[PDB]
């Protein structure tokens, strides 16, 4: 509906996510597309400058994900 397999609660520097930890292992263990999240998070936050951004990623059984950020 979809079925949730994990929720991942991070804080990441705005615009500056990479596939490295915590992102790689936190998402990858559930098969979520690491690079897609990196690019999406960076698009969602690059224009925030030097901020630290709370982000929650929900990962589903089909390996898709959704996410929510908080400003800032």
């Amino acid at each position: 509906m979809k079925k949730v397999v994990a929720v991942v609660k991070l804080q990441l520097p705005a615009g500056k996510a990479t596939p490295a930890p915590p992102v790689g292992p936190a998402l990858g263990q559930h098969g979520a597309n690491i690079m897609e999240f990196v690019k999406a998070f960076n698009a969602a936050t690059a224009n925030m400058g030097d901020a630290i951004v709370p982000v929650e990623i929900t990962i589903y059984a089909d390996r898709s994900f959704t996410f929510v950020t908080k400003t800032p």
Binding site: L10, L12, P13, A17, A20, P21, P22, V23, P25, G28
Partner: protein, 58 residues
């Protein structure tokens, strides 16, 4: 990678989090009552968190 493990939530530890990034943290992950702060290598911090080495890849 190294992790600095601190008891607490991101909310509870909020005041010291910018200092972790200033010290070189690449990102934070809240996990069951703890904050895991990821660093390329250990650094000088006053908090008495636990240093643990982690592989990239569960």
């Amino acid at each position: 990678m190294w992790v600095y493990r601190l008891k607490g939530t991101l909310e509870a530890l909020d005041p010291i989090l910018p200092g972790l990034f200033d010290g070189g943290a690449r990102g934070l992950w809240e996990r069951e009552g703890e904050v895991w702060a990821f660093f390329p290598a250990p650094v000088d911090l006053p908090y008495e968190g636990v240093w643990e080495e982690v592989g990239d890849e569960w």
